[PDB]
Design an enzyme around this catalytic site. Structure first.
Site, PDB file in Angstrom:
ATOM      1  N   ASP A  28       0.786  -1.139  -0.085  1.00  0.00           N
ATOM      2  CA  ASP A  28      -0.040   0.077   0.136  1.00  0.00           C
ATOM      3  C   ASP A  28       0.784   1.200   0.046  1.00  0.00           C
ATOM      4  O   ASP A  28       0.652   2.393  -0.576  1.00  0.00           O
ATOM      5  CB  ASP A  28      -0.852   0.095   1.238  1.00  0.00           C
ATOM      6  N   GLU A  65      -4.938   4.527  -0.795  1.00  0.00           N
ATOM      7  CA  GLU A  65      -3.639   3.492  -0.473  1.00  0.00           C
ATOM      8  C   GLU A  65      -2.968   4.125   0.634  1.00  0.00           C
ATOM      9  O   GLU A  65      -2.551   3.187   1.536  1.00  0.00           O
ATOM     10  CB  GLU A  65      -3.007   3.660  -1.800  1.00  0.00           C
ATOM     11  N   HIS A 102      -5.154   3.255   4.107  1.00  0.00           N
ATOM     12  CA  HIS A 102      -4.712   1.723   4.067  1.00  0.00           C
ATOM     13  C   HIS A 102      -3.792   1.314   4.844  1.00  0.00           C
ATOM     14  O   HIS A 102      -3.622   0.866   5.884  1.00  0.00           O
ATOM     15  CB  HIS A 102      -4.798   0.986   2.738  1.00  0.00           C
ATOM     16  N   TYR A 117      -2.934   0.026   9.090  1.00  0.00           N
ATOM     17  CA  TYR A 117      -2.266  -1.104   9.757  1.00  0.00           C
ATOM     18  C   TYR A 117      -1.101  -0.625  10.780  1.00  0.00           C
ATOM     19  O   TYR A 117      -1.198  -1.324  11.815  1.00  0.00           O
ATOM     20  CB  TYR A 117      -1.012  -1.679   8.918  1.00  0.00           C
ATOM     21  N   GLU A 120      -3.274  -5.365  -6.747  1.00  0.00           N
ATOM     22  CA  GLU A 120      -4.718  -5.127  -6.215  1.00  0.00           C
ATOM     23  C   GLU A 120      -5.483  -6.457  -5.768  1.00  0.00           C
ATOM     24  O   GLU A 120      -6.160  -6.446  -4.658  1.00  0.00           O
ATOM     25  CB  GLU A 120      -5.545  -4.221  -6.950  1.00  0.00           C
ATOM     26  N   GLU A 149     -10.106  -2.453  -2.492  1.00  0.00           N
ATOM     27  CA  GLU A 149      -9.011  -3.215  -3.536  1.00  0.00           C
ATOM     28  C   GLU A 149      -9.795  -3.847  -4.392  1.00  0.00           C
ATOM     29  O   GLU A 149      -9.485  -3.703  -5.607  1.00  0.00           O
ATOM     30  CB  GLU A 149      -8.094  -3.994  -2.767  1.00  0.00           C
TER      31      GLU A 149
HETATM   32 MN    MN Z   1      -5.746  -0.349  -4.115  1.00  0.00          MN
HETATM   33 MN    MN Z   2      -4.855  -0.531  -0.476  1.00  0.00          MN
END
Ligand code: MN
Ligand code: MN
Ligand code: MG
Ligand code: MG
Ligand code: MN
Ligand code: MN
Lengths: 287, 86, 683, 287, 683
Positions: A51, A82, A86, A90, A149, A183
């Site tokens: 990502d 991204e 995303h 994490y 993806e 995704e």
């Molecule tokens: Mn993506």
């Molecule tokens: Mn992503």
């Protein structure tokens, strides 16, 4: 015929990890074996890397070369998701579950892991090879992006889904499902752009592009097998994950308008369960 | 030839120059005298030499001020400053 | 979940396509049997209970000492002889959670409904056994409901004041502003809401002792008042609520409204201070012709003319102010200000809109003072004189400050018993007793005006409940005809009781001779127009009750002229909020907001259908937001012509209706004679 | 020291065009004179055209050359707002107020306009001149970006704010206020990134970069004065607009860590209405 | 850029490696010639000037009427006979920007320095021409500087009060809190800073008339007072500065301290209320021994003992409070609280640390009351009695609220003229006149204490300037010896002048007989210890001046016993941060913050070198931040032993030092006898 509906879908799917409180996973995390926690951390770290590069490099570079303000707006939005949503989520998961030293160690581990470096080298290399006004180099990078993806994320996604499906780590799992939902639409959209370029070619050129796509898929696949074994052997799941990545490889090919390449297999059912101000006028003063 | 160091115990840069002056005395102490004066205890001399911060290094020759250096200086720069007047 | 709450949740569980309204009575039975009868302290006899309550500082001894124990026991027997039963669970829940007396640890319940009513009646009667029994019959029949302060605190030692409102005039001085803060806190600690008239305060950029641009305006005074009401938060059990009123021609009117904006910064925003805007007819005229208006600096006008801006008729003196070079002002757009009012009410429900000329066109005590501002509920409209609070060890000039002596008639129970006259007279006597027994030492103007004006507020509630339970739509002309007749009857008997009290005590209210009651100008429309029902269906509702006629009004006018009138003001329709549940009534004369109220209490979801709601009268109980606001304005104006004070008129707005619609409703209310507009509730 | 804080402020300011209903503006639009409608259209097109450059080039080019994952994410988010939110918002305002043919003509006019083109191409020229691994060229582009975000937009923003402060065109004025609030934070953020580069330079190089910034400001300012008279003389507002330009030029300079260039002036009130613990260890109580 | 500012900008332009300090005289000459003389309106004679100023409401006609015009003319002539020249540009700039009288449009200068001084002298003398000329000589020589309110407003009509500070005792009631807010706003309107004692206010969660856990603590009162001071902020000339003082054993001490936290929410954060903490010796004892301490609920102590918590001796009553089950309290860590204090001072400079036992061990008027709190500048330590403000129409029990009339001696100019005795006596007479002519009608307790106590404040300034211009380091023992001798002489002559005034007027301050002055306990250390200089260099400074010996102090003690003392308090050293520029003096007895102050007034920076700063005395003007704070504590404690009130002691700290260093300085100040600590300035 499709960008506007993707624009609307992408913006209506907007989310932030802070919307999901993570302290509820604290106990089911504490209860996992050391092997399970290790695999889980590493899996999410591998996802974070993907990502990071998809947000920093992949999506912005494709946005640069694709024509049309609306197409660019969709690709820019996907790029933001991204790295601003995303990749960051994490860290929210890591900061909740793990002490700083374990977090530091896993990020050091991504830098030195040969399979993760190889897959990044290959994908980012193709992004950086795009030449202005050269549709073939762009197609190749879009194939790479679809493979990231719709295929490469899935060796990572398996494990959060596997736990979610057993009623474990469900808050982290909720985040992961939101990422996966994004995704899936990103892979479809980029797939449609790739097909546009492919459809402009002669039959001879198309035959070469299919060769490129299949050779690239096989090369990525062979590397992903080794990565999968490296991560999952200690938790006993490598064969199961391999079936899952083959399943998703077929979905990536389909997103590119190609026939499935791997034979169908039974996926772990646990993982399947894891899925106004109106002004006055002169006539309002008389009744 | 005298290198006079106007310093104070609270001055951070004055603590950094102290070891530099000890090395300079070991290398040049046959031709150079090093004098330290604490400006917190000796305000009249600091006032007489119109010295306006610390560390302030005065090169004196036969009682007259021939050069003035303000702030921290490395050994080599102090050697160059003194060697002009030897 | 508790059994009674669980049974209450079966109201919305629909069987055969109909709500299980009969489950509510089962909810009351379960609630009582399982919670109340178990957690009410029971004594061997009434003597032991009374001794326990007086000794433990739960009751005052002075009011019970006026009766022998035989009289008190007979009064309590009269209360319990009715065998009153709550018809909805929410009524009993409200009473036994808010108004029932509990032990100091709140674990048990000391007062039943028949006990609180008996104590309130014994307080009202003041030594009279027959009067106490009459009050007991009045309240246990639920014909009349004393206001929340009066019902709660009557005859209790741990109390506040029985007065609901405090309307304070703030003069243009630092001493007067400091005294306003002090009096606001001293009346908020008593429980009653406090409203302040800030139109006399000079605007921002005015001079303080010949140095220019010195004042920070009325917004600083609103900050001080807001923090004063926050400090006097009454334990935090009920947050300190205060109102601030400003004339729309005051220069600070834009900054006055800017404090209720959501986008307003914390450096200007006030939170606990409700705001109201007083709009003279001159502003409406200026907006109508779309001509530029002027907001004036009050202190320049005071210096030039020797009188405050709000003590002068703006319809006459607006031109004089405009063509006066020594009067400071800035051009404004009256239509833009009206749109700002409409959008502010849409966004937050503020400000309260007071049509000053609508109030003063039929104000009986204009000689004492014109009505410059209203209360926190935007329904009290009384003459007030500002108090000139001077420096220490200097005598202060004490004016008149308004107070609420409130009580509500239950229109349903009043007209079922065919006792409009008896209920109105007994309520007037009770409110007179409340006003007389009120002695507030820290508010000099409030105490002086309570002693002098002797003003009371007799409101009505359950109008929509009575209309819907009798098959009359709230917007229907028959409903307006019924309201006309009922409130003309209420006004007739309130005036009659006031004159009877004046005759029996030998005294009227202060400066009565200048009022329109003495001159007979008040009774002109009553001796010239017949207010008997024009509908046969409505006339049947009043059957068995003598509807006052033109000749009866002439006799009442002669009686008032000969004997005077004890109360300067008698009727004002309060919002009638949490106490409306206990009486099983709709709130005030307003239409019902929702047919079934969805309320959250703790971890439970409680449902309260409006009283008498069923399948036959489901569409008669039309929701207020579904109603035409113009017809609600017509209804209130029909009621308003028989109420000497104002009515707490809340606007119920749909989400789709814009600010132009709200402004149209406001201008139609102004055109129809509506005195005040309380709230803009948007759904 | 600042990127995570700006991340937070940026994402919490997220909004979408659909949130503001525009149709109620027609109730005040119909009452404006031809010159007022003409100026508004021209200003709006000016803002639209400049903001498109920022979305397609300005933000993405800076995101490309800046090092740091978190900075790239914030910059991606800002680029997204330009392309996905701001651009759609400007289009929505136009489509509400003018018919299709009128929109096309206004854009044709503003596209040919000498003063709009001069500033648009000056800014774009600096973005195109950024060289890989050259922080001086990056800094110059950041200065250009800050000047656009914090200064050049404001000759345009003036008019919608002027109406907004009077109770006219409130729906589009609300939209413009949200856009302006985003550009303000964009300008501050890019300003901090420029100061970081500036602070890494020698004293001689700093003086040279200051001269660059002031020289650029002067060129843009002199063109803004001409742009301003060209649009606002017909509605009698140019004097007050000029005060607003200088006030915002000073903010742009402060964003770049520089001193204000212009003397302090008051702004039109209508536009304003629109706008080391160490624990005690004992022995310290004894002396 | 103006020519004078550009010439003043040349100070830091170093030629030959030297500062151009001679450019400041050129800067002041340019300032005068090009701005002041051009913008000063001139009259053909003094008669025309006085007539114009009296008729145009610039001067009071009352104070000028006691002198014939020839007397006023000769006073002005002897003011201009000095031909006073400002030594620095900043002195003239500050005077003609802050104190010089200007026209109503603030465009022309009506008052020179010699006219302000003449008017203030004529006000002080009150009909005496010779005394007026004595005051003129005192002020034109700049030996004595009246406080900023006195210097700015003496003889003016557009004036507030001549009192620089007020201290209010707030009692534990709503009436008292509202009256405290009123008095705070009234005195802030007068321009003086207001300090309030909140230690008598009952804690948060206490009972209000059997209603438990209803109080908001002192923090609600802080919010009220903060908004009162914001509202009465002198229209924006200078933001309304108020002070709140709380005992460290009050329960709300943590909530009181949290108001200055940056992380504190706006609902608990005050912005214009300076906070001060009163620390008895018991708290320091508990922190030293690391025992867990208890902060107490004041209302429980009041109910149990009948006296407020701050009215009793903490050192004696602490164990009784802790062992009392009826006294509610909560456990705190005194060392953690001290660390919190240190971190609060490091981050914001608050609170003002007041050591109550350090004040009351040498307090002469402990019989009247202990000193429970200080002023806004933490230097006015006087006995005060709380006022019990009752309900309206009820007589209030008026107590004593401290009013402080301030005045500063210029140590450099006093010592250079060898006129300690005459300057101190004339300053005492002027402060007595200021106290007498000051009446405040809206503060009954302030007025009562002004009439009865007659307390004045005679401060000193330019201590560091005098020491550096005499080649004495502020931290040197010679500097402490000079401070000891000079302030012993100042105390001697202040006491002598107070006794002479008491003899001449035949009256002493109220309750003088119970003070240590009457019993002779005040003079014990003076008749036992000789305070003559121990260093020959210091003794040479007092050449030509009679240093009071032990025999002279015995004679003064006998004289005070025979005739009494007119002033309860005489000496208090205020920061004097504004008038220090005009007098070309360092602020207070504090060491200089910067050798050359950098100030921006407009778009131009204006450098102010320290008074007398040059090349020969550069290192004698050591900046306060570079100095050892222990040595500064030693200096202030040497001064404090001769000052009956407090000293505005500011702590100048470096960023390197931690909160433990701040706590060490605080504890050293407490151990050395420091009464109050003003600020913790960090560099
Ligand atoms: Mn993506
Ligand atoms: Mn992503
Ligand atoms: Mg006044
Ligand atoms: Mg009390
Ligand atoms: Mn934009
Ligand atoms: Mn932007």
């Amino acid at each position: 015929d499709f960008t506007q509906m993707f624009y609307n879908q992408n913006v209506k799917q907007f989310w932030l990890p802070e919307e999901i409180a993570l302290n509820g996973d604290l106990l089911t995390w504490k209860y996992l074996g050391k092997n399970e926690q290790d695999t889980y951390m590493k899996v999410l770290a591998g996802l974070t890397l993907l990502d990071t590069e998809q947000g920093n490099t992949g999506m912005p570079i494709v946005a640069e070369h694709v024509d049309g303000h609306q197409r660019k707006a969709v690709l820019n939005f996907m790029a933001m998701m991204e790295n601003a949503v995303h990749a960051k989520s994490y860290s929210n998961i890591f900061m909740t579950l793990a002490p700083t030293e374990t977090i530091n160690e896993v990020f050091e581990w991504v830098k030195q892991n040969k399979y993760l470096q190889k897959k990044a080298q290959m994908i980012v290399g193709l992004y950086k090879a795009i030449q202005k006004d050269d549709e073939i180099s762009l197609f190749k990078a879009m194939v790479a992006s679809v493979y990231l993806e719709s295929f490469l994320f899935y060796s990572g996604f398996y494990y959060p889904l596997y736990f979610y499906g057993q009623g474990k780590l469900m808050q982290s799992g909720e985040i992961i499902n939101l990422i996966l939902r994004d995704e899936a639409i990103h892979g479809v959209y980029v797939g449609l752009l790739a097909q546009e370029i492919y459809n402009k070619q002669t039959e001879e050129k198309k035959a070469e592009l299919r060769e490129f796509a299949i050779d690239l898929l096989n090369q990525l696949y062979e590397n992903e097998l080794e990565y999968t074994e490296d991560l999952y052997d200690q938790v006993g799941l490598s064969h199961d994950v391999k079936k899952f990545i083959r399943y998703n490889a077929n979905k990536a090919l389909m997103n590119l308008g190609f026939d499935p390449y791997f034979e169908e297999e039974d996926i772990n059912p646990i993982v399947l369960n894891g899925l106004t101000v109106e002004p006055l006028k002169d006539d309002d003063f008389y009744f | 030839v005298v290198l006079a160091d106007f310093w104070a115990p609270w001055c951070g840069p004055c603590k950094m120059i102290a070891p530099v002056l000890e090395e300079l005395d070991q290398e040049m102490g046959d031709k150079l005298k090093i004098v330290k004066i604490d400006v917190d205890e000796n305000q009249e001399t600091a006032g007489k030499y119109g010295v306006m911060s610390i560390p302030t290094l005065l090169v004196l020759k036969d009682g007259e001020v021939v050069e003035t250096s303000v702030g921290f200086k490395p050994k080599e720069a102090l050697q160059e400053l003194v060697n002009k007047h030897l | 979940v508790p059994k009674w709450i669980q049974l209450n949740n079966e109201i919305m569980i629909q069987k055969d396509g109909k709500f299980q309204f009969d489950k509510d009575k089962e909810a009351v039975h379960s609630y009582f049997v399982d919670y109340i009868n178990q957690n009410t302290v029971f004594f061997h006899n009434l003597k032991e209970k009374l001794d326990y309550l007086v000794e433990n500082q739960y009751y005052e001894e002075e009011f019970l000492s006026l009766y022998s124990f035989e009289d008190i026991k007979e009064v309590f027997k009269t209360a319990y002889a009715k065998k009153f039963r709550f018809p909805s669970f929410m009524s009993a829940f409200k009473f036994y959670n808010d108004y029932a007396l509990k032990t100091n640890d709140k674990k048990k319940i000391l007062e039943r409904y028949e006990d609180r009513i008996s104590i309130v009646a014994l307080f009202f009667a003041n030594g009279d056994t027959e009067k106490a029994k009459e009050y007991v019959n009045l309240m246990i029949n639920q014909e009349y409901q004393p206001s929340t302060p009066t019902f709660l605190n009557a005859g209790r030692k741990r109390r506040g004041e029985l007065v609901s409102c405090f309307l304070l005039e703030v003069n243009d001085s630092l001493n007067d502003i400091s005294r306003a803060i002090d009096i606001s806190m001293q009346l908020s600690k008593l429980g009653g809401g406090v409203s302040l008239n800030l139109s006399k305060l000079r605007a921002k950029g005015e001079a303080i002792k010949d140095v220019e641009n010195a004042t920070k305006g009325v917004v600083g005074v609103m900050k001080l008042l807001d923090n004063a009401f926050r400090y006097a938060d009454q334990m935090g059990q009920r947050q300190g609520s205060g109102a601030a009123y400003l004339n729309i021609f005051h220069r600070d009117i834009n900054d006055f409204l800017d404090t209720k904006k959501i986008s307003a910064d914390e450096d200007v925003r006030v939170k606990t201070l409700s705001i109201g805007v007083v709009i003279p007819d001159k502003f409406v005229e200026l907006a109508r012709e779309d001509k530029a208006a002027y907001v004036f600096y009050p202190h320049t006008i005071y210096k030039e003319y020797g009188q405050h801006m709000d003590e002068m008729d703006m319809n006459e003196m607006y031109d004089k102010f405009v063509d006066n070079p020594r009067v400071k002002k800035e051009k404004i757009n009256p239509r833009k200000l009206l749109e700002k009012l409409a959008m502010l009410r849409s966004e937050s429900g503020y400000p309260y809109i007071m049509f000053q000329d609508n109030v003063n066109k039929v104000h009986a005590n204009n000689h004492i003072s014109k009505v410059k501002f209203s209360n926190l509920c935007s329904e009290v409209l009384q003459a007030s004189q500002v108090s000139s609070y001077t420096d220490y060890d200097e005598e202060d000039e004490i004016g008149l400050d308004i107070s609420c002596n409130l009580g509500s008639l239950n229109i349903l129970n009043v007209m079922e018993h065919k006792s409009i006259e008896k209920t109105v007279k007994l309520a007037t006597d009770s409110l007179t007793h409340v006003s007389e027994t009120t002695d507030i030492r820290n508010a000099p103007a409030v105490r002086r005006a309570n002693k002098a004006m002797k003003s009371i507020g007799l409101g009505a509630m359950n109008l929509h409940g009575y209309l819907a339970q009798n098959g009359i739509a709230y917007e229907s002309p028959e409903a307006r005809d019924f309201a006309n007749t009922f409130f003309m009857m209420v006004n007739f008997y309130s005036i009659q009781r006031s004159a009877e009290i004046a005759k029996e005590k030998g005294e009227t209210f202060d400066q009565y001779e200048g009022s329109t009651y003495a001159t007979g100008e008040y009774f002109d429309k009553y001796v010239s127009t017949d207010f008997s029902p024009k509908y046969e269906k409505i006339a049947n509702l009043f059957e068995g009750m003598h509807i006052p006629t033109t000749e009866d009004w002439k006799k009442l006018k002669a009686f008032v002229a000969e004997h005077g009138m004890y109360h300067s003001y008698r009727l004002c329709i309060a919002p009638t909020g949490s106490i409306s549940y206990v009486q099983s009534s709709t709130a005030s004369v307003m239409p019902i907001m929702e047919r079934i109220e969805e309320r959250t209490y703790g971890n439970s979801k409680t449902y309260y259908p409006m009283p008498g709601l069923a399948s036959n009268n489901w569409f008669f109980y039309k929701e207020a937001y579904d109603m035409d606001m113009f017809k609600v304005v017509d209804m209130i104006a029909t009621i308003q012509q028989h109420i000497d004070q104002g009515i707490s008129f809340t606007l119920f707005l749909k989400d789709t209706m814009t600010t132009r619609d709200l402004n149209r409703i406001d201008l139609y209310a102004h055109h129809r004679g509506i005195k005040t507009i309380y709230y803009a509730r948007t759904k």
